[PDB]
Amino acid sequence: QISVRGLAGVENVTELKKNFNRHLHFTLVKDRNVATPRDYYFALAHTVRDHLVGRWIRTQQHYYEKDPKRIYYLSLEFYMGRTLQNTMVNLALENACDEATYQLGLDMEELEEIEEDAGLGNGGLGRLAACFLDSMATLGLAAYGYGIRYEFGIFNQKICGGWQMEEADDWLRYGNPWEKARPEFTLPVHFYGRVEHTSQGAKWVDTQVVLAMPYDTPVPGYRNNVVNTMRLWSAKAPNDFNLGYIQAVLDRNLAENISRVLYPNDNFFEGKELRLKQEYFVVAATLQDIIRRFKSSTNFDAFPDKVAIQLNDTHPSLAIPELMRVLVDLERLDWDKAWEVTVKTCAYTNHTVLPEALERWPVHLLETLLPRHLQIIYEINQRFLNRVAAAFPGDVDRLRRMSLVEEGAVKRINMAHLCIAGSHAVNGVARIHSEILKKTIFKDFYELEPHKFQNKTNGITPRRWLVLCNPGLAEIIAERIGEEYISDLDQLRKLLSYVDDEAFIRDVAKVKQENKLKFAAYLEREYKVHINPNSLFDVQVKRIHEYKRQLLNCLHVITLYNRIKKEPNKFVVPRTVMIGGKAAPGYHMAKMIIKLITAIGDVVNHDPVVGDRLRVIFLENYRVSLAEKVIPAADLSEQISTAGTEASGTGNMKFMLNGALTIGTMDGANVEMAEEAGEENFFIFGMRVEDVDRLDQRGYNAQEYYDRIPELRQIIEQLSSGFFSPKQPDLFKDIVNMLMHHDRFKVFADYEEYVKCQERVSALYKNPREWTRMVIRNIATSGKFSSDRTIAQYAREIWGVEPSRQRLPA
Amino acid sequence: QISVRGLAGVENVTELKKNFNRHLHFTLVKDRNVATPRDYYFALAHTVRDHLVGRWIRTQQHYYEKDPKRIYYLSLEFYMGRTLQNTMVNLALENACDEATYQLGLDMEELEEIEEDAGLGNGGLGRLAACFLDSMATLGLAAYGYGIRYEFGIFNQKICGGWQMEEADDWLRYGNPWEKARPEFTLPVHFYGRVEHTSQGAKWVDTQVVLAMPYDTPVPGYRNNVVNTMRLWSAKAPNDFNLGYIQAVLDRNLAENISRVLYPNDNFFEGKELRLKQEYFVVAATLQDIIRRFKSSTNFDAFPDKVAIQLNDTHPSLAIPELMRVLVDLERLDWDKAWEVTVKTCAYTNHTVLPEALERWPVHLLETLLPRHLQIIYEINQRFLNRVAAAFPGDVDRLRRMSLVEEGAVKRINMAHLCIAGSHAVNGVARIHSEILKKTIFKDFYELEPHKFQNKTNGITPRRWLVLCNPGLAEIIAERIGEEYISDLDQLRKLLSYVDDEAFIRDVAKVKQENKLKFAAYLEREYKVHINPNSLFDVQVKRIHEYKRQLLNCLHVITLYNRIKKEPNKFVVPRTVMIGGKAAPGYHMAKMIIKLITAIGDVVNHDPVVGDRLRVIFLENYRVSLAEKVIPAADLSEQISTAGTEASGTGNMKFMLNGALTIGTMDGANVEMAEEAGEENFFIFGMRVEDVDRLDQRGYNAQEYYDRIPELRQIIEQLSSGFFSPKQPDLFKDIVNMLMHHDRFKVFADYEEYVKCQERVSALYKNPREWTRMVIRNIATSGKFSSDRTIAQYAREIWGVEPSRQRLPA
Ligand SMILES: O=c1oc2c(O)c(O)cc3c(=O)oc4c(O)c(O)cc1c4c23
Ligand SMILES: O=c1oc2c(O)c(O)cc3c(=O)oc4c(O)c(O)cc1c4c23
Ligand SMILES: *Cc1c(COP(=O)(O)O)cnc(C)c1O
Ligand SMILES: *Cc1c(COP(=O)(O)O)cnc(C)c1O
């Protein structure tokens, strides 16, 4: 149908149809008379999968022959979403499959909706890992993603009576056609036990053994015939485990619980034993696999020349003492040599500065679970602090501040300090964040080893986040500038030449209108809720957190409502305000915020005086596949975290690529986005980091804002008095109390500037031509935020490898 | 290579090779350079599976069009063994696959050894279900096997220091290519809750829900293109189950434990709650599936014309009150009509008379777990006893004896009494067993309803138990009489014409020698143990139980040893005595018996005076695939249960078909075997049932035998004094004590006759020609013991359907 979706040659279409029918018959054991649409989805998935396998085998064979340096990306989260369309895009099969299925009497878009998301992540950090795998394959790197195959990913969110309910995400129920179990490469992982000292060093003995069984998923590059591997570990009990009889068999679940469920915490540390087991499990199985692959090529001097290990946050930080354990206890290298190898192999990416997110494991936990690793951590600490003492003699407070061991009520290990000591590179995820790391939380470490500290600004893959989710926009762009931008996003800069082109203006605006109608239709059919498609689509989608300030958005919504009620017959730009995202099940305030959003909706959406001028929708079950629908439909992107709290953001970049304008603070990657587009083409408001610091030194007093802003006072009075909860007048007392007395994120301090900035948005939206021109300026300068740029920087500045755009033979 | 293994046409061989390479590449994602022999096994399995699917789809389509009466065989056990070779045999693919794999540079026999047994049964009852599925498919019946997909089947048995150790049988570790998950036909099963009475009858409410997910395995008939289904249920928690968050997800295992593990009890009732859950789970999911299939054709009058339900033992007895529950509570039929339908639908097979095997469930268990079923059982009981009272007025003891409710310390439900009341047919499994049922344990029921009581003598499938495991014997038979006997075993009677044929005598004896050499080679390569292939192979393989009297065999072994030690330079016929079988983990006496066998081996096998004249081997991990190896190698089959205890036996029949002579008591099917072959062609010894009864009335006194038989006294003195356990002299005190003071099975009473009978065996073995002639007379009269005969009798006399030998189109 459309050019970016590839060729539909008669030979290819015929072959796809034959293979579809073969899988339906032989693989699924169905005929056309009994087949459900789910069976048709599976027949298509297996047909497309067949096209991957040749390239997958040849890619891995190629890496064996050429022996390049291998990149190992260690993450506890891979937020993959659906695989079918992404695979078709990267293999240039989309139009052919569309044609083949049409001829079989089927709608491919309908079949695509049947696939479950691989929801093996929480939010930004998890989705970053997924975008990165796509870029690494596209750039021809010998890269492997290593993680856990969770049986249950991020919970499915249902809204009942305005409240979040959690349901198990049983994503493997119907099978996963993309994975290949590899039980032949099963590896043992050890837990508990004790340390024995011989004349030949330490021995870790009397351990409990859990098996790690790998499952491999293909990761296709964009049209280069490269197919890399994501290897995810599943926990299995040994067959003599606990071996009255019946109970011993049932107790196998105790071992296998390690890979059962993703911890649903986003930017929050929960110090639970099962989480620690997951962290060690992924690390121990991965490192054995790495060493096995290295040895098939006892000289560990060349180890850092053949292996890079990237730690996604501190979650796999145990890689550092585990590598030391293997090199020293098993391979019998001396400490200093092993340490040199370790440091040169490992690199660490920090994702947040929020104190409650930092992993600080109780010593007593590590002592029981991982007694040898604790000894190694103590030894690392002693040697590191000796270096600190020599560099800064007599500075006793620095010693205390930099220690990997934290003193207190409970002794803890600071995993971030372990990662810095044991890595040759430490990076933040946006320029402002990397600067904050050097100035504040890691200042001491930066003074000791300035060379370790880098920036690598986050990015997103333009495959999933443009071509896949917004084919209409990808096409109108391709018509003018060709197809090369899909793997070289900087080429979007050529679009600045069309900012005064009347044909292009009309096409950009038409693509947006079509996306909005399609999403408006989606909401009716699937959620029985009506929206006006002519309204400004005002969208905030991301995990629910106090720092992200969904509450500030709520205050604006209520302000707009109060202004309409005060002057009903005055013209206002119509808005659909959409907020979506999950709260961690134990995060009470975030759960209260969701209830507030729905309660506001209950009032606003049913008030006849408002009409269709304002609508407030909570988008249920926000996840990757929902993002692919809502982002192309958005006019306004809400990126309103308190300055200095959102390390980068990536949702911000997705909206910019897809033709929404941004209202945002100077936080995270927003700063770089505004710098790329021009500040005049962005809706910037609020305190800068420096303003927040100044307010903190003086002391934040919320009462002052309440006293001075009559519109703010009225909202607080409405909240307190039960206006939004008539049957439970004090329902929102916790929210009011937090805002008035202990708001860490200074919601009130940005309220006035935010409301005023929102008026400027409404003014611009009244002039469609000028709105669209600003949109064009945003799309045209979004090139920097491709994860291809990010990965090329990691490859050159951290991993010491050259990216390649060259095709492997088909 | 050999004719019974089918054609190896050039077209077929070429096609098999192409498909093998396709599966290796696309299915397994391997090339020839990285492929293990396990990968080659899987490539072959998928290739053969492809040939089933067309016939499977067409068979099920055929049953939809024709709408025949459907047979539902309900069993908690399906002891299937391996599937690859059986599938090739039934599809006439064996030679072609052999050729195709040879050409690819592979040994097919080696690949066959890689397949795990589907060990979803304990012994006789489980293997009977498997033989039956094979016969039902071969006879063209519209039959479905329904059971549980256990994650762990019967434990793997290891022998450590002479003791049984149990290991989890993780048979699904590498995947199962034969099954097809059918998550689309998932059904809810209810547990716990309470009964509510409305104006519209009873309601079962506040239940806990567990999902039943079916997996279908194809069951191919012998060369008739019929492929039936075995449907096995897996337990799944609902997604809102227990829905802090993490724990609620982990607690899903509580529901899914239902299908986790097979109870390893053979002919022994253990009244555990989890076992009861398994029994209801299979019944509730199966009956919903039955009713769904029936309705796709509210007139339940025709229900018994379209449905037969066969209960394999009392394990699925809850089918009776469950059918009543559905018909009365859900479909709103009146009681009497529902009861008529139920009785006409259900039939019950009894497998043992041993009191400790009978299921007698505590009322308090049923009250908590299944409150509505208990109410229904009480109502059945009241109405049944009203009929008893009317037929036998004033006979108050009969009322007590026949009640489904047992009075006592704990009130219990007798499941056998429930099955008789609720079935139109009740059968035993051999003529003597069916007579014992009428005379003793079910005498009262037989007097009330004589017409219900039938015999159906057990059988075995000649596909697995001749063609598959003994191709050499199948071939020499086919050379003389053709191939028709494979599905018409009565034709073996034609072999009586060759009893004086010198060529045939030599061929029969040669096939046995070849089988013995192959098994002798197997024992060395796999278990590092040497045996003399010229010795008489004396084999007792079956579950370890006191009733089966492995102990009597032990006494004979020790007697032979003592006789050699007394007269070393006297000639004796050399023997290899092989005993194998598993003991239930909690069965202490059976575990002690295994230890005795190995301890005897330790003495006998290392005594230089004995030489290679006597060897005692315990065959580890006896299971279906081991049976297929050892049975063709046997000379003498030990079938030595106390008269009246072994209901039928089926191992006995397997040995007869494969050219072993039988030493046995007049018990179970041994009686019919001796009747078929002629008593002169059998080695019969010992008490008859009548002799056991006489001894019981007088009182069994073991001391008497000890006092009168000096050879017996010496063995007991050796056991007591530590001769077979020098480092633990009293190790076998439990065994000695049981034999002397509380032997339920009268081991000593048969000792003298058994030893004398064994001398007659040794005498005949000295004359190879006459041994082989007797063998021919056994093989030639084994036809009655085909499960095809058994199933034809079930079909005609119980299910009311006609078997068909006619082929479906290919
Ligand atoms: O008790 C909690 O307090 C919190 C906070 O005070 C906060 O600011 C953020 C969070 C957060 O992100 O995730 C959480 C969880 O997954 C959880 O199980 C418990 C809590 C939080 C939490
Ligand atoms: O405690 C037991 O006593 C038994 C007997 O006394 C017996 O004659 C036969 C048996 C038997 O066959 O299986 C068993 C089990 O699976 C189990 O867990 C416990 C027992 C038995 C058992
Ligand atoms: C991109 C993305 C995120 C991250 O969004 P931010 O606004 O950067 O927090 C979270 N969840 C999903 C499903 C995403 O696609
Ligand atoms: C046939 C068979 C049995 C039953 O043997 P009996 O001697 O009749 O008890 C038990 N186990 C296996 C593995 C079998 O093949």
Coordinates of N, CA and C and ligand atoms in Angstrom, one line a residue, chain B residues 79 123-124 127 465 541-542 548 622-624 627 639 646 649-652 654, ligand 4:
Chain B
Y79 N 0.2 -44.9 31.3 CA 1.6 -45.3 31.3 C 2.1 -45.5 29.9
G123 N 2.1 -48.8 37.2 CA 2.3 -50.2 36.8 C 1.1 -50.7 35.9
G124 N 0.5 -51.8 36.4 CA -0.5 -52.5 35.5 C -1.7 -51.7 35.1
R127 N -0.6 -49.0 32.5 CA -0.2 -49.6 31.3 C -1.4 -50.1 30.5
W465 N 4.2 -54.6 22.2 CA 4.7 -55.8 22.9 C 5.1 -57.0 22.1
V541 N 10.0 -59.0 36.9 CA 9.9 -57.5 36.8 C 8.4 -57.1 36.9
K542 N 8.2 -56.1 37.9 CA 6.9 -55.7 38.3 C 7.1 -54.8 39.6
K548 N 3.2 -59.9 45.6 CA 3.8 -60.4 44.4 C 5.0 -61.3 44.7
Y622 N 13.0 -49.8 36.6 CA 12.1 -50.5 35.7 C 10.9 -49.6 35.4
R623 N 10.7 -49.6 34.0 CA 9.7 -48.7 33.4 C 9.4 -49.3 32.0
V624 N 8.5 -48.7 31.3 CA 8.0 -49.2 30.0 C 9.2 -49.5 29.0
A627 N 11.1 -52.5 30.1 CA 10.3 -53.7 29.8 C 10.5 -54.2 28.3
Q639 N 5.8 -65.4 37.9 CA 4.5 -64.9 38.1 C 3.9 -65.6 39.4
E646 N -3.4 -61.4 42.8 CA -3.1 -60.6 41.6 C -4.4 -60.7 40.7
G649 N -2.8 -59.4 36.2 CA -1.4 -59.3 35.7 C -1.5 -59.1 34.2
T650 N -0.5 -58.4 33.7 CA -0.4 -58.2 32.3 C 1.1 -58.4 31.8
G651 N 2.0 -58.2 32.7 CA 3.4 -58.6 32.5 C 3.5 -60.1 32.1
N652 N 2.8 -60.9 32.8 CA 2.6 -62.4 32.4 C 2.4 -62.6 30.9
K654 N 2.9 -60.4 28.4 CA 4.0 -59.9 27.6 C 5.1 -60.9 27.5
Ligands
LIG4 C1 3.2 -54.6 32.1 C2 3.9 -53.7 33.0 C3 3.6 -53.7 34.5 C4 2.5 -54.7 35.0 O1 3.3 -55.9 35.3 P1 2.6 -57.1 36.2 O2 3.7 -58.1 36.3 O3 1.3 -57.5 35.6 O4 2.4 -56.4 37.6 C5 4.2 -52.9 35.4 N1 5.1 -52.0 34.9 C6 5.5 -51.8 33.7 C7 6.6 -50.8 33.3 C8 4.9 -52.7 32.6 O5 5.3 -52.6 31.3

